Amino acid sequence: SLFFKSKDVMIFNGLVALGTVGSQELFSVVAFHCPCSPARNYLYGLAAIGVPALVLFIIGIILNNHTWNLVAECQHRRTKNCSAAPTFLLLSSILGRAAVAPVTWSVISLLRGEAYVCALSEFVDPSSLTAREEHFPSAHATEILARFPCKENPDNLSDFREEVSRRLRYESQLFGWLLIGVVAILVFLTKCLKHYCSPLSYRQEAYWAQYRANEDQLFQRTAEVHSRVLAANNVRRFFGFVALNKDDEELIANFPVEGTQPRPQWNAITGVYLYRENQGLPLYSRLHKWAQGL
Amino acid sequence: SLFFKSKDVMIFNGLVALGTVGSQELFSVVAFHCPCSPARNYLYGLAAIGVPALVLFIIGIILNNHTWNLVAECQHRRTKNCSAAPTFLLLSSILGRAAVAPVTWSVISLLRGEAYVCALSEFVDPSSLTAREEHFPSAHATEILARFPCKENPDNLSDFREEVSRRLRYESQLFGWLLIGVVAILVFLTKCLKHYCSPLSYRQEAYWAQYRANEDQLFQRTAEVHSRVLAANNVRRFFGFVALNKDDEELIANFPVEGTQPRPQWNAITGVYLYRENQGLPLYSRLHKWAQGL
Amino acid sequence: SLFFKSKDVMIFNGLVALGTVGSQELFSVVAFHCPCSPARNYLYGLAAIGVPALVLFIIGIILNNHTWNLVAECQHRRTKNCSAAPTFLLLSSILGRAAVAPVTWSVISLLRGEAYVCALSEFVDPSSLTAREEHFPSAHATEILARFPCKENPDNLSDFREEVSRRLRYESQLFGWLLIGVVAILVFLTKCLKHYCSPLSYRQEAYWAQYRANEDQLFQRTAEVHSRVLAANNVRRFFGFVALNKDDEELIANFPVEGTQPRPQWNAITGVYLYRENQGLPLYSRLHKWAQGL
Amino acid sequence: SLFFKSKDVMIFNGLVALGTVGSQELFSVVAFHCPCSPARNYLYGLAAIGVPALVLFIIGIILNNHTWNLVAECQHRRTKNCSAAPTFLLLSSILGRAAVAPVTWSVISLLRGEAYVCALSEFVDPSSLTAREEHFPSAHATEILARFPCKENPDNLSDFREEVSRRLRYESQLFGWLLIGVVAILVFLTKCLKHYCSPLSYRQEAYWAQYRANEDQLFQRTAEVHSRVLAANNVRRFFGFVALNKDDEELIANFPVEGTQPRPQWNAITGVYLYRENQGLPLYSRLHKWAQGL
Amino acid sequence: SLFFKSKDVMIFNGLVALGTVGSQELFSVVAFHCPCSPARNYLYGLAAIGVPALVLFIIGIILNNHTWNLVAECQHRRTKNCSAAPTFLLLSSILGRAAVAPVTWSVISLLRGEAYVCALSEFVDPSSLTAREEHFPSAHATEILARFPCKENPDNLSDFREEVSRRLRYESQLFGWLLIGVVAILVFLTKCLKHYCSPLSYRQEAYWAQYRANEDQLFQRTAEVHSRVLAANNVRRFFGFVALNKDDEELIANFPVEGTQPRPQWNAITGVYLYRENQGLPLYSRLHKWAQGL
Amino acid sequence: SLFFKSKDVMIFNGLVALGTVGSQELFSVVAFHCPCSPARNYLYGLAAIGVPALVLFIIGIILNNHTWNLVAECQHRRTKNCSAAPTFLLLSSILGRAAVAPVTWSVISLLRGEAYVCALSEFVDPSSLTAREEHFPSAHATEILARFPCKENPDNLSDFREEVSRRLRYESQLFGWLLIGVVAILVFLTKCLKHYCSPLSYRQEAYWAQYRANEDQLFQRTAEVHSRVLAANNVRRFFGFVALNKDDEELIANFPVEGTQPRPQWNAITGVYLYRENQGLPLYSRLHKWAQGL
């Protein structure tokens, strides 16, 4: 019922309430708990921020199929068929669509500010503090500094703690805003240099994107159907018949197989594609190049 | 279910409640937290206001397709085919539809007033304050001035703090109203000079806008359909058949392809368009000029 | 779902509640905050009232298409074809339908009274105050006068502050009522002089208004349809076919184009119209005059 | 959805609640705030009552089409074709249907009483007060009298203030009841003198009223339809076709136009009508007289 | 939606709640506020009771069509065609159906009692009071008597005030019950003398009442329809066609007009009717007498 | 919607709540308020009880049609055609069906008891009181007795007041129970003497009652229909046609009239009926006797 409720929603008030309960339970298990101790809390900030960043970056590399297209190119093409510049352009596209989510996580965590007050409480220079009389034993300076983000200052130092909290939350949100700013201008310049340094136009690149979406969707659908009819042929060879549904019996009726496709042909349609043109007409994928090659 | 709920709404009370909860969570992560410290809070006001301004400005440049039409003109036209004046008119249209949203953000943030009291608390001249007895150490003047927007004044200076808060909130809302005023008269004069300095009439310009909307919509639809039938041809060449839906089988029935269109033809229909006329009859796009050119 | 919910409403209790929440958020960002300071609060009253007045006036000029009809007349007619008196009558109609909304805003803001107590607290003569013993340092007269609308008077002067608040709120609501009175009699005399100084009758002017509404609606509809069929012709010339809907395929079936209409013909049907008569029969628009001219 | 909800109501509890909220907001902006000051509060009572009276009177003159019939008679008839007595009878009918609403407003405001206590607090003779010991400085008599309706009397004078409030609220409600009484007997005598001094009977006058309603409704409907078919003819002459709806295509099918009607004919059917009879048979409008005149 | 909701009710709990809110607002503006002052409160009781009585009496005379039948008889019959006795019987019927509502208002106001305690507090003889020790300055007797209905007696005179309130509320409710009693026996004797002094029977008078209801309803319906077809004839003579609905096109199909009916014929069917008989058969209206007269 | 909601009820909880609110408002205006004063409260009890009794008795005489049958018999029969004994039997039937409702009102008011304690507080002998020490000034005896039902006794006499309240409420409820007892045995003996002294049987009297109900219902229905077709004939003679509904057009189709029925025939079927028999067969009404008489 996952695709059913995600496509056609049962009651969205109760759905948002159950999502709030699950978000309460999951955000409780990932809630930031600062170790109010020196040399220990920047390590926790680095772990609890950069590790979900690295996880989301890894996930973005995994789910991108251009990763496996490039790894298949270097795997079976195996002779630098695509050179260092198409490999660099493909890697840039992959790393960008990957680094969407860790940048968004690190920006939200910087605008939250909590990891940065926790990570830099101990590095705050005690002489630079204001709004009270300076009360800092130089032996226990870094420890009572690092104990600030848990609100565990003495009440004699609550004004000092509010000053350090506001200053480091400022530096956190400033780093977060300058990060989302440079990420926005980076996104802008990558789009501009992509449109400027593409050989084909932008309307043809939109047609190419529509082709690649249609071809991957049609290929997954007919690969599922072709594999189902091949499985039905083998199963019928075993038992003498196949228990098919009505739709599956329609599939066996419409689309017959004598056999599947050879491995070099599957290798020919796989890999990274770099926009060839056969006799002036464009080819938009390796499957398209292979189909025109016959 | 995004397009489904956005086109046909499930219960709008619960929808507005879940939108209020998401707005609470997202506006909590972007809430203005003033660093009550000198030389530090105008930098935060500038970041937390001008960076969402720059982000929305960048987004407005990105989503405008006239940006990519102009970049395609300077890319493949490559010889100043459209001169500096059509480039200037196109750039003015792009920068205007971009700067809709940062101007609206900066106006809302100026009418909020919080960024401006935060950014200019430290610049308030202490001798210009009234409604109390003047209590300002000239050594600690700027710091206790800059600590005002957090309501962290001493209670001996609460009247002073209310005076500075009202004065700088006045200057904020005055800047916001004069900004929305000059933006309104700027919008008015750009529309008047566009209508005065267009060669064609305003009813024909409305017809041209309707043509451009119809042509981009029809072109995206038939580019998706043409790419789908080309993908089905390549997929059928691979497997021997295509798993099509009923609508997709209707698309393969109606619209056949022998091949796609060459890259110079895609280049011919792309770029910025400057209203030519072929033999007295008007042409309204590069696609229209190309179709009449055959 | 904007036109759908605006034409057929989902639950109006929740709709009015979400409208109250949005009105709370938007009226919070435009709420009148008086700068209780001399020489500063009438500037804020003038800005926060006359700037939404000027914005609504500009918007009323923009959305009125008679503005662009007059600008097209002076643009391409370019020789005072319509003289100073038809230009004056058209400008009067435009400025009236524009100044509906700033007059309504300034009347609501005057009947609210808050901008006027804020703007004229400092100009109240201190000797003219009653209902208490006169307590005004002549050095700090204007400042403690201007601090009245924030309810920031001393408690020794609360009776004085209530007296000035009631007097200036009186002058505000009196100005608002005399404004809506002179606007009502102005509306009455403009309607009477329009009906007295029109050459044609009032039933024929009602027929003319119905014609202009029907002609603009029919012209926008068939301009959208004609542009869609022209776009489909160009798109079919590009790809070989068009992905049309069923309704769009009906439109291509019914209404063919060979070509669009020339620019002087579009110029002929555009501009301001001043009720000509061809051979005794009336013509009600430039499109009607152009169609009879063939 | 205005005509849809006004003709077929969505939930009337929520509708009455949203009407109560809008009535709270609009009646808050027009709420009577008495300036408790002499020579100032009768001016406010006169403004805040007689100005909505004058506005509703102006609106009643505007929306009455007999106003424009009479102005068209004096405009193009231009020689006193209808004499001073039909002009006086028509003006009496117009001013009566206009003065329905200001009389109802002034009666509701007099029965409210608040404008009258506010307007006449200062004119109350201080020696005529009872129910307490007379405590009135003759220098500050009128001011402390005029400050009564805000309940701003001293507590030594609360009995005096209740006495003046009850006496002037009596005179207010007495004026309101005598006003609605003389308006009722005025309505009665106007109806009686209309029925006594009409030349035709009252059943024929009811038939005449039904004719005028049917003729104005049928004329507006067929003027909209005739203007729509004329607009479609001009639009088809421009583009080559018209994008009509199904109902509009039925209208072009049923009702053709060759041309519209001349301006003297439109003048002939417009104006005030005074019940002629052609050869003993009655004529009930200028359109009826014109149609029989052919 | 007035006739729709009045004929088929939307939710009657919310309808009764909105009626209670409107009754709260309208009964607040007409609530009895006694002027606790001598020579002033009986004038207010007389106004606030006898003026809604006179208004409802006037309204009952207006809405009764026998009023206009009698005024048409004395208008165009103009020679005492119906004598003083049929005029007296018709006037008695009119004044009775008129005086239904003021009698009901004055009875409800007398049983409320508030107008009578207010109107006669000052006339209560102070020596006739009991249940306390007599405490009345003979100078201030009438004023402290007249101040009783506002509960503004001294607490030394609260027993006196309760005694006068109960005595005058007794005389109020006694007057109200004797009024509704004599009105009931008046209604009974008018019905008995009507049935005794009618020339025709009571079953025939019930048939006559059913005829008059059917004839007025059928006459209003066919007068509306006949006026609509005459209006359509004149409108078609103007434009060339009429925009009719489907029902209206059925009306033009079924019922044609060549012309309307002359004014003496309309005079013949109008007026008061006094039961003639033509050749032994009864005639039940002037329309029936006119139709038999042909 | 009165007959619609009374025949098919909208929600009966809200209906009973609105009936409770209307009963609160109407029973508040008729609530018993005892004048606690001697020689004054029995007059109020007599008015407030016997006047609704007399009103309901008058209403029961009015709505009974046998009243008008008897008045028509003495009117046009005019010679004692029905003698003193049928007149006495008819009058007994009329006065009984009339006096259903005043007896029920006076019984409910006697069982309420409030009118009787109020009416007889002053007549209670002061020496007959018990349960306390006798405290009655013989000068102020009757007044302090009559002030008992308002609970306005002194607290020294609260036991005396409870004793008189219980004794007179006893005499009230005893009078009410003996009244409903003698009314029940009166109803029983009237039914027994009616069945014993009727000439015809009780099954035939039940058939006669069913005949009279069917004949009055059928006569009212066909009198309405016959009057409607006569009205349509006269209306068609006026205008040339009648605007009939579909049901009314069916009525004109089915039932034609040439003329109505003469006045002596209407007199023949009206009056009181005393069970004649024509040639041994029974006649059950004057209409039946008249129809057999032809």
Instruction: Give me the residue from F36, F61, F239 closest to E222, CB to CB.
Output: F239
Cα(F136)–Cα(F142) distance, rounded to whole angstroms?
9
The CA-atom distances, in angstroms, between D21 and each of C20, D24, F130 are 10, 5, 63
Cβ distance E10 to D6 less than 8 Å, yes or no, reads no
* DSSP state for residue D127 in the 8-state scheme: G
Contacting residues for C134 by C-beta, under 8 A, at least 6 apart: C126, C127
Helical ranges in C99-201 per DSSP H: 100-112, 114-120, 141-146, 158-197
Q: Looking at beta carbons, which residues of chain B come within 8 Å of C235?
A: 215, 218-219, 222, 287
Cα(A12)–Cα(A20) distance, rounded to whole angstroms?
12
Cβ distance D243 to C261 less than 8 Å, yes or no, reads no
Q: Name the minimum distance, in Å, from the CA of B294 to any CA of chain C.
A: 9
The two three-digit tokens of residue F189, written as one number: 């003996």
Strand runs labelled E in chain A = 277-278, 281-282
Neighbours of chain C (3+ CB pairs under 8 A): B, D
Q: Please, what is the angle between helix D100-112 and helix E12-29, to 10°?
A: 70
Cβ distance F11 to E11 less than 8 Å, yes or no, reads yes
Q: CA angle, corner B147, sides to B141 and B151, nearest 5?
A: 130
- Verify B-C touch: 3 or more CB pairs within 8 A: yes
Query: How many CB pairs below 8 Å do chains B and C form together?
Result: 199
The two three-digit tokens of residue E34, written as one number: 């006694």
Residue to test with chain C: of D76, D234, D245, D265, most C Cβ within 10 A: D234
Q: CA angle, corner A185, sides to A179 and A188, nearest 5?
A: 140
**Lookup result for tokens 């002779």:** A79
Which SS3 state, helix, strand or coil, does residue D170 take?
Answer: helix
Cα(A253)–Cα(A246) distance, rounded to whole angstroms?
10
Nearest partner of C152 among C186, C113, C118, C188, judged by Cα? C118
The two three-digit tokens of residue B263, written as one number: 């890259």
By CB atoms closer than 10 A (0-12, 13-18, 19+), residue D177 is buried
Cα(C45)–Cα(C40) distance, rounded to whole angstroms?
9
Helical ranges in C30-83 per DSSP H: 41-63, 65-72
Cα(A144)–Cα(A134) distance, rounded to whole angstroms?
13
Cα(C8)–Cα(C111) distance, rounded to whole angstroms?
34
Query: Which bin fits A104, alpha (ψ -120 to 50), beta or left (φ > 0)?
Result: alpha
Q: Sign of torsion, CA C170 C172 C173 C175? A: positive
Taking each continuous run of H as one helix and of E as one strand, the counts in chain F are: 13, 2
By CB atoms closer than 10 A (0-12, 13-18, 19+), residue E8 is exposed
Q: Looking at beta carbons, which residues of chain E come within 8 Å of D191?
A: 62
Nearest partner of B294 among D54, C170, C233, judged by Cα? C233
Neighbours of F199 (CB within 10 A): 9
Helical ranges in D240-273 per DSSP H: 246-254, 263-268
Cα(E85)–Cα(E91) distance, rounded to whole angstroms?
10
Cβ distance C204 to D270 less than 8 Å, yes or no, reads yes
By CB atoms closer than 10 A (0-12, 13-18, 19+), residue C212 is middle
- Verify B-A touch: 3 or more CB pairs within 8 A: yes
Rounded CA Rg of chain A: 29
Answer yes or no: are the C-beta atoms of A195 and A202 closer than 8 Å.
yes
Rounded CA Rg of chain F: 29
Answer yes or no: are the C-beta atoms of E269 and E287 closer than 8 Å.
yes
Amino acid at D25: E
φ, ψ (nearest 5 deg) of residue B236: -65, -35
Amino acid at B109: S
The continuous run of DSSP H or E covering B281 comes out as: strand B281-282
Amino acid at F263: R
For chain B, the residue count is: 294
Cα(A121)–Cα(A116) distance, rounded to whole angstroms?
8
Contacting residues for F177 by C-beta, under 8 A, at least 6 apart: F111
Residue to test with chain C: of D68, D140, D144, D249, most C Cβ within 10 A: D68
Cβ distance C33 to B113 less than 8 Å, yes or no, reads yes
* DSSP state for residue A107 in the 8-state scheme: H
Cβ distance F18 to E12 less than 8 Å, yes or no, reads yes
Answer yes or no: are the C-beta atoms of B257 and B67 closer than 8 Å.
no
Cβ distance F235 to E225 less than 8 Å, yes or no, reads no
Nearest partner of A225 among A205, A197, A208, A244, judged by Cα? A244
Amino acid at A162: E
The CA-atom distances, in angstroms, between A4 and each of A9, A17, A144, B3 are 8, 19, 54, 15
Cα(C285)–Cα(C293) distance, rounded to whole angstroms?
12
Q: Looking at beta carbons, which residues of chain B come within 8 Å of A288?
A: 230, 234
Concatenated DSSP letters for D53-72?
HHHHHHHHHHH-HHHHHHHH
**Lookup result for tokens 């509060």:** D41
Long-range Cβ contacts of A83-92 (<8 Å, 24+ apart): A86/A272, A86/A274, A90/A66, A90/A272, A92/A190
Q: CA dihedral defined by D174, D180, D185, D186, rounded to 10 degrees?
A: 120
Q: Name the minimum distance, in Å, from the CA of C4 to any CA of chain B.
A: 8
Beta partners for C273?
none
The two three-digit tokens of residue A38, written as one number: 């020196």
Cα(C213)–Cα(C285) distance, rounded to whole angstroms?
11
φ, ψ (nearest 5 deg) of residue E277: -140, 125
Neighbours of E40 (CB within 10 A): 18
Cα(F118)–Cα(F149) distance, rounded to whole angstroms?
6
Residue to test with chain E: of D210, D226, D233, most E Cβ within 10 A: D210
Cβ distance F47 to E178 less than 8 Å, yes or no, reads yes
Cα(F56)–Cα(E181) distance, rounded to whole angstroms?
10
Cα(E37)–Cα(D31) distance, rounded to whole angstroms?
29
* DSSP state for residue C285 in the 8-state scheme: S
Nearest partner of B223 among A198, C240, A289, C229, judged by Cα? C240
Answer yes or no: are the C-beta atoms of C92 and C101 closer than 8 Å.
no
Query: How many CB pairs below 8 Å do chains C and D form together?
Result: 204
Instruction: Give me the residue from D185, D221, D284 closest to E243, CB to CB.
Output: D221
Instruction: Give me the residue from E16, E203, E223 closest to F266, CB to CB.
Output: E203
Instruction: Give me the residue from D16, D162, D226 closest to E239, CB to CB.
Output: D226
Cα(B176)–Cα(D113) distance, rounded to whole angstroms?
44
Cα(A173)–Cα(A169) distance, rounded to whole angstroms?
6
Contacting residues for F277 by C-beta, under 8 A, at least 6 apart: F283
Answer yes or no: are the C-beta atoms of D160 and D132 closer than 8 Å.
yes
Q: By CA distance, what is B26's nearest residue in A? A: A108
The CA-atom distances, in angstroms, between B63 and each of A22, B60, B98, B224 are 35, 5, 9, 20
Q: By CA distance, what is C249's nearest residue in B? A: B218
Chain centroid offset of residue F101 CA: 5
Cβ distance B51 to A287 less than 8 Å, yes or no, reads no
Cα(E277)–Cα(E284) distance, rounded to whole angstroms?
9
Q: CA dihedral defined by D180, D181, D183, D186, rounded to 10 degrees?
A: 170
Cα(E17)–Cα(B91) distance, rounded to whole angstroms?
61
Cα(B270)–Cα(C162) distance, rounded to whole angstroms?
70
Cα(F52)–Cα(A270) distance, rounded to whole angstroms?
102
Cβ distance A173 to B48 less than 8 Å, yes or no, reads yes
Q: Sign of torsion, CA E249 E254 E255 E258? A: positive
**Lookup result for tokens 């005529």:** D128
Cα(B200)–Cα(B150) distance, rounded to whole angstroms?
57
Concatenated DSSP letters for E59-81?
HHHHH-HHHHHHHHIIIII-S-S
Q: Sign of torsion, CA C129 C131 C136 C142? A: negative
Answer yes or no: are the C-beta atoms of C127 and C120 closer than 8 Å.
no
Chain centroid offset of residue C109 CA: 16
Strand runs labelled E in chain F = 277-278, 281-282
Cα(B16)–Cα(B21) distance, rounded to whole angstroms?
9
Chain centroid offset of residue F43 CA: 24
Cα(A11)–Cα(C41) distance, rounded to whole angstroms?
51
Instruction: Give me the residue from F10, F29, F267 closest to E112, CB to CB.
Output: F29
Which SS3 state, helix, strand or coil, does residue B278 take?
Answer: strand
Instruction: Give me the residue from C191, C261, C281 closest to D259, CB to CB.
Output: C281
Instruction: Give me the residue from C58, C227, C238 closest to B214, CB to CB.
Output: C227
**After which residues is chain C discontinuous, taking C to N > 2.5 Å?**
none
Neighbours of A10 (CB within 10 A): 10
Q: Please, what is the angle between helix D286-293 and helix E202-239, to 10°?
A: 60
Which SS3 state, helix, strand or coil, does residue A281 take?
Answer: strand
